[PDB]
């Protein structure tokens, strides 16, 4: 261990960076999309469109 403290790192002996990397990639993308579109489907918290919210107005 080149000036390490824990063995945390041994995880990558066990796990495989490539699997983790590629999955995180997808996982995050999906959550990201979820939130984005989710938000943009409301009334408050839609940028991209006129305030349909009719916030109290009517």
């Amino acid at each position: 261990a080149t000036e390490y403290r824990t063995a945390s790192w041994k995880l990558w002996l066990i796990l495989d960076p490539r699997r983790v990397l590629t999955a995180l990639f997808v996982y995050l993308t999906v959550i990201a999309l979820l939130i984005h579109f989710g938000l943009l489907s409301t009334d408050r918290l839609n940028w991209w469109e006129f305030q349909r919210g009719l916030p109290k107005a009517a």
Partner: peptide, 24 residues
Amino acid sequence: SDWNLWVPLGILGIPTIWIALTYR
């Protein structure tokens, strides 16, 4: 404007720190 409501800051922030420090 983030006033009285640090909720997301806490949720985002706290882990950010202990993720920093635990895995060195």
